[PDB]
Design a protein around this nucleic acid. Structure first.
Lengths: 197, 106, 157, 127
RNA sequence: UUGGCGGAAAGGCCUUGGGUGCUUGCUGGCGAAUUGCAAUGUCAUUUUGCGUGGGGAUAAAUCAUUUGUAUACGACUUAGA
RNA sequence: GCCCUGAAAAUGGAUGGCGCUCAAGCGUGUUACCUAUACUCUACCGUCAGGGUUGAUAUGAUGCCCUGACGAGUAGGCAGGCGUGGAGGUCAGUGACGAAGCCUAGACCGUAAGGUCGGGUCGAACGGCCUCUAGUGCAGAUCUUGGUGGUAGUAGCAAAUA
RNA sequence: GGAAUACUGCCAGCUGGGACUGAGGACUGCGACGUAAGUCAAGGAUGCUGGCAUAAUGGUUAUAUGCCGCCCGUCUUGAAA
RNA sequence: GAAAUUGUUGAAAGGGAAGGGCAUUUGAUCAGACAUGG
C-alpha cells in the first residue's frame, strides 16, 4: 500500500523490526530502513557487546577468509538479523532481499521523503520500563565501526536543514488554516459537516 | 477518472502447505484491507485474476490473465484461499493479484 | 490377418436418457433489486457506469437504462450477479417498459429505428424524474471506481 | 463418428521409467520393479518415482479408446478392413506398417466406401 | 525564464516573470447503442539493433621488439616515429 | 517458587536458526487458527462375497447384470499376464510398388511387463490367432569376450663429457 | 413481591453467503401437493445464454520457480555409511 | 551398421556436482474434431 516504505530505525527493537521487515519483503513490499544506528537491543550494553564477541570467535579455522563474516556497521548488524529470517539461499529469498535497503543516518532521496515507525517493534511501546537496553550505534563502534562521528556530524547538518524546512511548513500551514477561516464557517462548510466532512 | 479500478488489490503469498510439503493446487492470497476471517467472508467466491506480460502476441495483445476464485478464508488475519483455472506459477509469490466485486450478491 | 478379430463388438445402439427430474422454477432476486434502483455495473463494456434498473426479464436478466442521454448507455440486458445495487432509487412509475422482453432483444451492423425511438420514449420520462433531485444527473453521468482506501466489504453503496 | 463415452480420464499420463535409467546408459527405461533390500524406491520414500500398480487402472468404459472415441484395430488388407463393416462407430482401422504403398490406396478407397475411419491415412502417400 | 539553496549517494529543492492547454467554481447545446448478459478492452519501463536532421569530437591497447628495480610460464617494470 | 553461587577441555557453533526480556521465558486458565497416506461423503481401478439372468427370441455363460465390504509388506507361497529361439494347425496373412533390422525430447493403446503407428535408413525375407516345445528375459557375480572413456596432450622421452 | 437476563438444552422453526460433486441413462419403487385434471425438490442435472478457429483447450518436451528427493546391489538387530 | 565414446552444426541451462518428485509460468512441438443451407 505504498511503492516503497521508509522506516525510521530509531527506538525500534532489532529482532522485532527484523521480523516485520522480513515478512514485508516476502510479501512484495519494498522497504528502506534508515537511521539504523539508533536501533536498540534489549538488555544492557555489556551483554550485547559480549554476545558480539562470541560471534567474533567464529571463523573457518583453515582460512578465516571463508569462514563467517563479521559486519560491524549498525545497518549491517541489522541486515544480519533480517537475513537469518529469510530463506536467503533460494531464488525467492534473494528476490525478497533485493527489495530492501538499510542505511546509517538518512542519506538523501529518503531525507525529503516521509518516514514511518513500526509500533510492534518500537522499544518504548514494547520494553517494560526499567529494563536496560543498548544503542546499536554505540555497540557497533565498540566492535570496530568507523563512522559514528561522521554520521553524527552529517545528522546535525541534516537536522538543521530539516528544521528550517519544517518551520516554513508550519508557517505555511498557518496561512492556510488562517485564510481558510472565512470559508471554514460558510454554507458549504455546514453542508459538508452534515455528511461528516 | 484518474482512478479506474474496480478490483481490490491482493498479493499472492504462498501455495497451501505444511512445513515441508506444499500443495500448488490451492493458493493463499492476502487481500488489501481485509484483516479478519469475518471480513474475508465477503470475498468468498469472487473472481481473481493474475495479470502478466509476454513477448508473443496472441489476440493481438501481450497481456495475459490467469483467472481463479476465492474459495474460503485462511487462519485468523484475513488471508484467503484461492483456486485458479491453471495454478499460479510460483515465481509469483509476492506478486499482485486482482480480486473483483462480482459475482455480487450484494 | 494383421490382428485376430474381436469376439464381441458392443452394441452401436445409442440409449435414451432416463426421464430426468429437474423442473425450471423461477429465480427470486435479492431484496435490493427493485426497479428504479441505481446499479453500478461491475463488468463488461459499460463496467463502471451507474445505471437505472427497470425490469426483470424472463431469461433472468435485468433490463437496464442509463439513461442514454445521461451517460451513453442504451436500454440493455445486464446480469444480476455483475451489478451492485445502490440504495439510491428513482421512481419508475411513468415509464412504459411493457414491451421489452427476451424476444425484443432476439438476434434475428445496423441500429433498428425502434430501438432508437424506444430509447427516447423511456429516457425522456426517466430524465424528467432524475432531475427532481439535485446532483443525481451528474452522479449518473460519472463513472464509479475504487479509490485508495476503499473497502468493499465495509462501504455502504 | 463414434458412440458416446464419458470423459476419458487418464489417471497417470507419465511413463514410469525404471529407476536410475536416467543414471546409467546400461539401464533401459522399460519398467522394472526394484527388488533391492535397502532401495528407497522399493520402500517408497517421499520424493522418489511412483511405481505402476493396479489402482491406476483405466475406467472399463473408456479404456482402449483413442481420443477419437474408437478402439483401434490393426488391418493388413481389404478382407481385414471389412471385419469392421458393422462396427464403424466403435473401431477405427490402422493399417499395418508393412503394407505396400499401392495396397494402401486400395484399403483406403474401400474404407471410404464403407465409412470406416482410418487412423493412419497418408500411409506411404505420394505428394 | 529571474534569483537562490542542496556533496551523505547532493542529481533534487525553493523562487521571479510572462506565454500556452485544461479548468468539475457555475449555466447551456450535442455525442455515446449493435463490443449484443462477464471473459483479451488503460500502457508502464528496460535494454538492443536498425531510420531520418542537427550539433559534436578526430584515440589507443594488445602481439612482436626491448629493460632487469621483475619473473617457473603467464604476470611485473622499462624503452622504441 | 523463579533467579544467583557451587558449574574446568580441547577446529568455530548451536533452545533447529534468527532473535526474543510486562517475552517470542517459567506456571496456569480461555478461545480462535494451521496441518497426515487417518476419519466422513462421492468418482474410478482391483480383490473377495452374496444375488439375478440364454424361458423361445444375433454379436462374449469361464459371460451379462445387481448389491455390500475390503486394499501396508521383506523372506516366501499361489494366481493372471507381458516378451524370446524353434514345432503342429490356421489366417489361400505382410513383402523388392520394399521383408527383417536400426535411428527418431513425433503419435496412440495398456496400472505394467509391453503393443501399435508415422517419418528416416535399409535390402529379403517376415507376422497375427489356437496349440507344442525350451540352451527363453540381466545391472551387478574382484562375472566372460570384445569395444570405449575421464585420467591427458598429462607422467614422461635428463646415466654413458659434445 | 413480580419480572427480566445469563447459562445449558430442544424444535420433523424460517432464512443469507462460499466451496467440491452431477456417478446413472426408456419405464417399473416409496412418497409428497393438490377438490380435481394434474404438478413435484419423490430410486444420481437440467434449463437459458454466450465464447473458440491458422483458435479456446489438451498431450508431450525444455527451462524457470515453490516445496520435497542421500547410491544402488548385498549380508545384517542396524547401511547414505 | 546399435551402444559406449567423439567432431561439427542448432537450441538451451549453469554463484562448491549433476540427475529425480508434485505443480504451474514461459518457449517449442503435436493433436481431436466434421458439417450447413449458398
Amino acid at each position: 500500500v505504498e511503492p516503497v516504505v521508509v522506516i525510521d530505525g530509531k527506538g525500534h527493537l532489532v529482532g522485532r523490526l527484523a521480523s516485520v521487515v522480513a515478512k514485508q519483503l516476502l510479501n512484495g513490499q519494498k522497504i528502506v530502513v534508515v537511521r539504523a544506528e539508533e536501533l536498540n537491543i534489549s538488555g544492557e550494553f555489556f551483554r550485547n557487546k559480549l554476545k558480539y564477541h562470541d560471534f567474533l570467535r567464529k571463523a573457518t579455522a583453515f582460512n578465516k577468509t571463508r569462514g563467517p563474516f563479521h559486519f560491524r556497521a549498525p545497518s549491517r548488524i541489522f541486515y544480519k538479523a533480517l537475513r537469518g529470517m529469510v530463506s536467503h539461499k533460494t531464488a525467492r529469498g534473494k528476490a525478497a532481499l533485493e527489495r530492501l535497503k538499510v542505511f546509517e543516518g538518512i542519506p538523501p532521496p529518503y531525507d525529503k521523503k516521509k518516514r514511518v515507525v513500526v509500533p510492534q517493534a518500537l522499544r518504548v511501546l514494547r520494553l517494560k520500563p526499567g529494563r536496560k537496553y543498548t544503542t546499536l550505534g554505540k555497540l557497533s563502534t565498540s566492535v570496530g565501526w568507523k563512522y559514528e562521528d561522521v554520521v553524527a556530524k552529517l545528522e546535525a547538518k541534516r537536522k538543521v536543514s530539516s528544521a528550517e524546512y519544517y518551520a516554513k511548513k508550519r508557517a505555511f500551514t498557518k496561512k492556510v488554516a488562517s485564510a481558510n477561516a472565512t470559508a471554514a464557517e460558510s454554507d458549504v462548510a455546514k453542508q459538508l459537516a452534515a455528511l461528516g466532512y | 477518472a484518474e482512478s479506474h479500478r474496480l478490483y481490490v488489490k491482493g498479493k499472492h503469498l504462498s501455495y497451501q502447505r505444511s512445513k515441508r510439503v506444499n500443495n500448488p493446487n490451492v493458493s493463499l492470497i492476502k487481500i488489501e484491507g481485509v484483516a479478519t476471517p469475518q471480513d474475508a467472508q465477503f470475498y468468498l467466491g469472487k473472481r481473481i485474476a493474475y495479470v502478466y506480460r509476454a513477448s508473443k502476441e496472441v489476440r493481438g495483445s501481450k497481456i495475459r490473465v490467469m483467472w481463479g476464485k476465492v474459495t474460503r478464508t485462511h487462519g485468523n488475519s484475513g488471508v484467503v484461499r484461492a483456486t485458479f483455472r491453471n495454478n499460479l506459477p510460483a515465481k509469483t509469490f509476492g506478486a499482485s493479484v486482482r480480486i473483483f466485486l462480482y459475482p455480487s450478491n450484494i | 490377418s494383421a490382428q485376430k478379430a474381436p469376439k464381441w463388438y458392443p452394441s452401436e445402439d445409442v440409449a435414451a436418457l432416463k426421464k430426468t427430474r429437474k423442473a425450471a422454477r423461477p429465480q427470486k432476486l435479492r431484496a435490493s433489486l427493485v426497479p428504479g434502483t441505481v446499479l453500478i455495473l461491475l463488468a463488461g463494456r459499460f463496467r463502471g457506469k451507474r445505471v437505472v434498473y427497470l425490469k426483470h426479464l424472463e431469461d433472468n436478466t435485468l433490463l437496464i437504462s442509463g439513461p442514454f442521454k445521461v451517460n451513453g448507455v442504451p436500454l440493455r440486458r445486464v446480469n444480476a450477479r455483475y451489478v451492485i445495487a445502490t440504495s439510491t432509487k428513482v421512481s419508475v412509475e411513468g415509464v412504459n417498459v411493457e414491451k421489452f422482453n427476451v424476444e425484443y432483444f432476439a438476434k434475428e451492423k445496423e441500429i433498428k429505428a425502434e430501438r432508437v425511438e424506444d430509447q427516447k420514449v423511456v429516457d425522456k420520462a426517466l430524465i424528467a424524474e432524475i432531475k427532481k433531485t439535485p446532483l443525481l444527473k451528474q452522479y449518473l453521468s460519472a463513472s464509479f471506481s475504487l479509490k485508495n482506501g476503499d473497502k468493499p466489504h465495509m462501504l455502504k453503496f | 463418428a463414434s458412440l458416446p463415452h464419458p470423459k476419458i480420464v487418464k489417471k497417470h499420463t507419465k511413463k514410469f521409467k525404471r529407476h536410475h535409467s536416467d543414471r546409467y546408459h546400461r539401464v533401459a527405461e522399460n519398467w522394472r520393479k526394484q527388488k533391492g533390500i535397502d532401495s528407497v524406491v522399493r520402500r517408497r520414500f517421499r520424493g522418489n518415482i511412483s511405481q505402476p500398480k493396479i489402482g491406476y487402472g483405466s475406467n472399463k468404459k473408456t479404456k482402449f479408446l483413442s481420443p477419437s472415441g474408437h478402439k483401434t484395430f490393426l488391418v493388413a488388407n481389404v478382407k481385414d478392413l471389412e471385419t469392421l463393416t458393422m462396427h464403424t462407430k466403435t473401431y477405427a482401422a490402422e493399417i499395418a506398417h508393412n503394407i505396400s504403398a499401392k495396397n494402401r490406396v486400395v484399403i483406403l478407397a474401400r474404407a471410404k466406401a464403407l465409412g470406416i475411419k482410418v487412423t493412419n491415412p497418408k500411409g506411404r502417400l505420394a505428394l
